[PDB]
Design an enzyme around this catalytic site. Structure first.
Site, PDB file in Angstrom:
ATOM      1  N   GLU A 113      -2.177  24.621   4.225  1.00 16.31           N
ATOM      2  CA  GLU A 113      -1.206  25.587   3.727  1.00 16.31           C
ATOM      3  C   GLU A 113      -1.113  25.542   2.211  1.00 16.31           C
ATOM      4  O   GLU A 113      -0.916  26.577   1.561  1.00 16.31           O
ATOM      5  CB  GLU A 113       0.161  25.325   4.338  1.00 16.31           C
ATOM      6  CG  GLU A 113       1.129  26.431   4.038  1.00 16.31           C
ATOM      7  CD  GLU A 113       2.503  26.144   4.532  1.00 16.31           C
ATOM      8  OE1 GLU A 113       2.725  25.031   5.037  1.00 16.31           O
ATOM      9  OE2 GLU A 113       3.359  27.036   4.414  1.00 16.31           O
ATOM     10  N   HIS A 114      -1.262  24.352   1.635  1.00 13.21           N
ATOM     11  CA  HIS A 114      -1.478  24.271   0.197  1.00 13.21           C
ATOM     12  C   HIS A 114      -2.721  25.032  -0.234  1.00 13.21           C
ATOM     13  O   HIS A 114      -2.659  25.860  -1.143  1.00 13.21           O
ATOM     14  CB  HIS A 114      -1.572  22.825  -0.242  1.00 13.21           C
ATOM     15  CG  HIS A 114      -0.267  22.242  -0.648  1.00 13.21           C
ATOM     16  ND1 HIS A 114       0.308  22.525  -1.865  1.00 13.21           N
ATOM     17  CD2 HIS A 114       0.574  21.389  -0.020  1.00 13.21           C
ATOM     18  CE1 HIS A 114       1.443  21.860  -1.979  1.00 13.21           C
ATOM     19  NE2 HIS A 114       1.630  21.163  -0.871  1.00 13.21           N
TER      20      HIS A 114
ATOM     21  N   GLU B  19       4.114  15.472  -4.128  1.00 12.34           N
ATOM     22  CA  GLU B  19       5.158  16.028  -3.271  1.00 12.34           C
ATOM     23  C   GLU B  19       5.723  14.987  -2.321  1.00 12.34           C
ATOM     24  O   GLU B  19       6.931  14.964  -2.075  1.00 12.34           O
ATOM     25  CB  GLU B  19       4.633  17.226  -2.490  1.00 12.34           C
ATOM     26  CG  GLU B  19       4.546  18.485  -3.323  1.00 12.34           C
ATOM     27  CD  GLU B  19       3.990  19.678  -2.557  1.00 12.34           C
ATOM     28  OE1 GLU B  19       3.436  19.491  -1.454  1.00 12.34           O
ATOM     29  OE2 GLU B  19       4.138  20.815  -3.054  1.00 12.34           O
TER      30      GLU B  19
END
Ligand code: HEM
Ligand code: HEM
Lengths: 48, 444, 216, 64, 285, 57
Positions: free
Chosen positions: B59-60, B136
């Site tokens: 998804e990144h 993150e």
């Protein structure tokens, strides 16, 4: 912090709950009833 | 007037089936603003240990360049026509969606197709995004409510792959290869499982034709029939307590079994959590709230907050409560929360069920407004339920539930169950597991 | 919120016997405090029924004890339970003393002093109750131990004449010992509450002697 | 409709209701490919030393 | 107050407003630090009797009919300045390893094509990231500082429009010992934009950006309520959003470069906060 | 095992039902167990008590 995994209790689990794939809804009443029936027979003896 | 007749004034979602197997669905509503989205059944539940966190990584790298419009041209067209790109991923769903305008629909569907079926990965991309996900995780080790939900799923689905985290552990993140990414892309970005759905001012023919002109040619067959298939897992019930006293407040999550999806007990337990519901410490009318948990908690200064809530997955889930409170207040807040649960279990009156009906209807209608939440409604509807459920159906299931059925269902799914406690922070006063369980079934 | 922490009796009981933060690794030998308490209240009960069936005089004492052991039904087990309950009391008591000596729990000072006062009180109670049946061993043990009290010069002779109630072991000595074998276990029960008070204040003790205030 | 067939040390678990056979990952495909390859090579060695018209004695299995 | 101000941006925006005007618009929404536990209800009574009159009120109905609304309004509700610019700065030395610097001049009041020029200008400059985990291919300030500084930073423009005055500027989050580079790089970018180096498809792209944002503020009934009520009090006359967009994209870069030329011409005000060991004051710019 | 599960569903769910359960259980087992205990005590002697030779006189 996402690397918090449980150590597996396969040495300690009951034979109904050794299966880590079957659901534990229809396995609930018998197990809870067996523990509570041991408590009940203890309570019967103490009341006697 | 005539609230039910006003509920019959709600449009219906057209459902059609693109020839690859692709579920498309549209709600032609009355606005110039459109939301077009793709919902994909590729969560974290469908993963190995070595593919843990591959989906978050995908998804990144979903938005970082393809084989068609490389590098940044995707983002440049987004900011060219002023598109509003957005995406999220859960343990069971993964969605990409676009908020945009009524006229850029062919170009937006072209963007969305080039996102999904032609995603391409690169070495500078994989190295830089590995560094990004290390940033993150290292800056979301302190996102405390997230850590509590991580602990709760990890302790309640022990052993089964549902206990994996959405990001994966760090030592599966810092060593992924492109080959495993390509395997995940190959095995879960498949035609029949996924949904294209639009909500806004646009007709179904336009959407069907554009999906025919772009989604003809994604997929439909597996790598030698390596079909991912659900396993209905097991809810353990335990406690993990992370004693870490150098924190201002303490978080407790308590949870029990999830009922599932298709059973109406889903709706009835959502009524019970409408009765219990949520308080945050910043309200007016604090000494007079109708919710008894919040009334007692405010008058006795117990907790900073609670949300008392539902989460469902395929044949399972976590029905529960979350509360945040000070390290000298956890026990009494705990006691009043079990008191509310058991008061609902054995002594459910009628007016509180009526209040639950009002709260649940208002929350449902207020949740289903704005184009993008209605598109998310349609996406999760056609994935899980396999149909857009109408809201007159919700009216019917609410009206077919009274105090008797509510106390039946809460006697089934709460009364003397084996809970799960994920506690984080200064929780030495947080009571031991046996007195939680002894507080469940109550003799009085 | 909760009656268990608002009602003032239950405040003391909830901070004594429910939410008491004991350490986690108690071995077998810390049961003996509760065992001494249960032996004590069973002693009090069996002695109460004994006191309802007993006539204390040197003419009548052995007649009455025989009467209890025969005619008043189940009084044979009441008598035998009182005697062997005193026996199990002192076995449990020497175990509790030996534990407190062994695991280094004797650092708790005023608790330990209250303990020694309790030990003398139990010894006096057992002595006077053992005088009570008024048999041969009773009689000569009584005379021996009272003149042992007379061994201290210049006051102890008159002190022993004073605790006799006579010039020998007489009826008056028998009823003095009946009254004190009755009234001392209540003092023992109250001082047991004092013992437990200081223990709750200072803190309990693990087996390893480590300051165990992290794993309650 | 059925209590899902508890196994034993005597009752074999049949081929159908495993239910591990339906979670085909790529590792099971890899393992089945290599297992077929092993069986292929062993039947090749065996068949060539089984059909020799000069081979008088027995084929002398190292497995046994 | 504590719960709201735990985000840093509330403190930053409030210290900028306390730095913005010399007058009553510098007052917070929030109660100040010392007044908690000092004020009486008599100010509240007087405040309602002089500001909650029937002459000052917009009643909006959605889901209702007209005459029910009109009748209950007619039965119950019949019951009855000029802030100056200041100039200057406010420094808030706090130490969170996050330099927060907002830099603002005075622009325009609400409801002018000049204000529309400022709006299309700030979408040229920089706004909220339209791509989640994005890289902002069009936000030119972010372009110039990504050219300049290779660090965690974030740059966004800023409009606070009011009925009488207004605020234009930008807002920057960075590290402590690298903030001077960021502010200087972004300001030299604003200089070379206000020189006149701003092209027509960029104007059209920002026109579509502002048209997108304005149609997407009024999607649900809440933003629709917000727009209609703030118009009907601010003006007393409803306007459809389509002809609002028509009035927006009627402008060109004439007023845009005139207004950016005003901004670089404008006497700056600013507010900084955080660990400010290497922070430009004004004079370094 | 479902016989223990249905025992849980019948007699172990409610509180006062559990108390009345152990009342009936303790009374019946009291009766039958005292009968069995006296039977074992007479079986272990069978010729020594007063009862049998008092009725055979
Ligand atoms: C206040 C409660 C008590 C009462 C009312 C009580 C009463 C009596 C009585 C009436 C007797 C004579 C019965 C007999 O000896 O056959 C007796 C004997 C005795 N009591 Fe207690 N007693 C009490 C508590 C205790 C306690 C706390 C102890 C120490 C554990 C104790 C130790 C004895 C002993 C050793 C005898 C002699 C037993 C024997 O020789 O048969 N009594 N008690
Ligand atoms: C009258 C008889 C006595 C009674 C009924 C009694 C009762 C108790 C009880 C209930 C406890 C707490 C047990 C626990 O926490 O596990 C205790 C603890 C203790 N008692 Fe006594 N006690 C008696 C005599 C004594 C004596 C003679 C001593 C020695 C001086 C003594 C020394 C202690 C000590 C040191 C502890 C602390 C145990 C530990 O934490 O290690 N007690 N007693």
């Amino acid at each position: 912090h996402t690397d918090i995994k449980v150590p597996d209790f396969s040495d300690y689990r009951r034979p109904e709950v050794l299966d880590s794939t079957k659901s534990s809804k229809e396995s609930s009443e018998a197990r809870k009833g067996f523990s509570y029936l041991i408590t009940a027979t203890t309570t019967v003896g103490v009341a006697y | 007037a005539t609230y039910a007749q006003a509920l019959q004034s709600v449009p219906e979602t057209q459902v059609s089936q693109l020839d690859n197997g692709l579920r498309v669905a549209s709600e032609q509503s009355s606005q110039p603003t459109c939301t077009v989205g793709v919902w994909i059944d590729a969560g974290s539940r469908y993963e190995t240990e070595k593919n843990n966190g591959a989906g978050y990584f995908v998804e990144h790298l979903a938005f970082k360049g393809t084989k068609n419009r490389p590098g940044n041209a995707l983002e440049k067209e987004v900011e060219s026509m002023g598109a509003h790109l957005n995406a999220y991923s859960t343990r069971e769903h993964t969605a990409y969606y676009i908020k945009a305008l009524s006229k850029d629909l062919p170009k937006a569907v072209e963007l969305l197709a080039d996102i999904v079926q032609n995603c391409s990965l690169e070495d500078s991309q994989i190295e830089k995004e590995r560094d990004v996900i290390l940033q993150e995780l290292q800056e979301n080790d302190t996102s405390m409510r997230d850590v509590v939900f991580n602990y709760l799923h990890a302790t309640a689905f022990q052993g089964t792959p549902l206990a994996q985290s959405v990001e994966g552990p760090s030592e599966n993140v810092r060593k992924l290869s492109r080959a495993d990414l390509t395997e995940y892309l190959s095995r879960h970005y498949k035609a029949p499982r996924m949904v294209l759905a639009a909500a806004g001012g646009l007709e179904h023919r336009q959407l069907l034709d554009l999906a025919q002109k772009h989604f003809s040619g994604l997929s439909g067959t597996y790598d030698e029939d390596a079909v991912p298939t659900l396993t209905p897992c097991r809810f353990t019930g335990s406690e993990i307590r992370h004693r870490e006293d150098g924190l201002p407040l303490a978080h407790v999550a308590i949870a029990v079994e999830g009922p599932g999806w298709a059973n109406p007990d889903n709706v009835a337990l959502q009524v019970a959590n409408a009765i219990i519901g949520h308080y945050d410490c910043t309200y007016g009318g604090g000494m007079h709230l109708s919710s008894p948990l919040a009334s007692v908690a405010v008058t006795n200064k117990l907790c900073q907050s609670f949300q008392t809530f539902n989460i469902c997955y395929a044949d399972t889930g976590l029905l529960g409560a979350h509360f945040v409170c000070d390290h000298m207040s956890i026990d009494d807040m705990m006691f009043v929360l079990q008191g509310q649960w058991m008061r609902l279990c054995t002594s459910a009156t009628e007016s509180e069920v009526v209040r639950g009906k009002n709260l649940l209807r208002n929350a449902l209608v207020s949740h289903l407004d704005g184009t993008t939440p209605v598109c998310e409604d349609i996406g999760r509807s056609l994935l899980t339920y396999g149909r857009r459920i109408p809201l007159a159906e919700w009216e019917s299931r609410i009206a077919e539930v009274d105090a008797r059925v509510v106390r039946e269902v809460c006697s089934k799914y709460f009364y003397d169950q084996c809970p799960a406690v994920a506690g984080f922070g200064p929780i030495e006063q947080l009571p031991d597991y046996n007195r939680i369980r002894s507080g469940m079934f109550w003799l009085r | 919120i909760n009656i268990r922490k608002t009602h003032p009796l239950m405040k003391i009981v909830n901070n004594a016997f429910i939410d008491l933060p004991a350490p986690s690794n108690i071995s077998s030998w810390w049961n003996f405090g509760s065992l001494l308490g249960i032996c004590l209240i069973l002693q009090i009960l069996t002695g109460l029924f004994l006191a309802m069936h007993y006539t204390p005089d040197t003419t009548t004492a052995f007649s009455s004890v025989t009467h209890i052991c025969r005619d008043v039904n189940y009084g044979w087990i009441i008598r035998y339970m009182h005697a062997n309950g005193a026996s199990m009391f002192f076995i449990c008591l020497f175990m509790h003393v030996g534990r407190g000596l062994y695991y280094g729990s004797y650092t708790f000072l005023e608790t330990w002093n209250i303990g020694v006062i309790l030990l003398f009180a139990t010894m006096a109670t057992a002595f006077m109750g053992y005088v009570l049946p008024w048999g041969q061993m009773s009689f000569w043990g009584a005379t021996v131990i009272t003149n042992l009290l007379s061994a201290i010069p210049y006051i102890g002779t008159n002190l022993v004449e004073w605790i006799w109630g006579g010039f020998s072991v007489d009826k008056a000595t028998l009823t003095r010992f009946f009254a004190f074998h009755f009234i001392f276990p209540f003092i023992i029960a109250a001082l047991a509450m004092v013992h437990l008070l200081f223990l709750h204040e200072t803190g309990s003790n693990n087996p390893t002697g480590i300051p165990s205030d992290t794993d309650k | 409709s059925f209590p899902k067939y508890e196994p034993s040390r005597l009752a074999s678990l049949p081929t159908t209701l495993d239910p591990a056979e339906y979670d085909i990952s790529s590792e099971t495909r890899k393992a089945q490919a290599e297992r077929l390859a092993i069986r292929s090579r062993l039947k090749r060695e065996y068949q060539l030393q089984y059909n020799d018209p000069s081979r008088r004695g027995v084929v002398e299995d190292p497995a046994l | 107050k504590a719960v709201a101000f735990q985000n840093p941006q509330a403190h930053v925006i409030e210290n900028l407003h306390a730095a913005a005007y010399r007058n009553a618009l510098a007052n917070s929404l929030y109660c100040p630090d010392y007044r908690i536990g000092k004020v009486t209800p008599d100010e509240l009574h007087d405040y309602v009797q002089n500001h909650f009159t029937s002459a000052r009120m917009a009643l909006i109905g959605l889901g209702v009919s007209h005459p029910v609304l009109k009748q209950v309004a007619e039965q119950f509700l019949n019951i009855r300045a000029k802030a100056k610019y200041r100039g200057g700065e406010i420094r808030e030395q706090n130490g969170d390893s996050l330099v927060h610097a907002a830099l603002v001049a005075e622009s325009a009041a609400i409801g002018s094509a000049e204000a529309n020029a400022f709006s299309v200008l700030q979408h040229v400059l920089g706004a909220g990231p339209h791509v989640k985990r994005g890289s902002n291919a069009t936000s030119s300030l972010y372009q110039a500082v990504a050219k300049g500084v290779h660090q965690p930073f974030d740059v966004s423009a800023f409009n606070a429009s009011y009925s009488d005055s207004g605020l234009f500027g930008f807002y920057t989050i960075s590290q402590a010992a690298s903030a001077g580079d960021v502010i200087k790089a972004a300001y030299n970018q604003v200089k070379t934009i206000a020189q006149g180096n701003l092209s027509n498809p960029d104007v059209q792209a920002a026109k579509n950006k502002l048209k997108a944002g304005y149609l997407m503020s009024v999607e649900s009934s809440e933003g629709f309520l917000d727009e209609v009520g703030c118009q009907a009090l601010a003006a007393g006359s409803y306007t459809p959003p389509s002809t609002v967009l028509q009035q927006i994209d009627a402008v060109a870069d004439a007023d845009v470069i005139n207004a950016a030329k005003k901004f670089v011409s404008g006497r700056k005000s600013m507010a900084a906060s955080g660990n400010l060991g290497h922070t430009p004051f004004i004079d370094e710019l | 095992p479902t016989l223990t599960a249905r025992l849980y569903s019948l007699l172990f769910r409610r509180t006062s039902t559990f108390a009345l359960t152990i009342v009936v259980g303790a009374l019946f087992f009291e009766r039958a167990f005292d009968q069995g205990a006296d039977a074992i005590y007479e079986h272990i002697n069978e010729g020594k008590l007063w009862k049998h030779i008092k009725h055979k006189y």
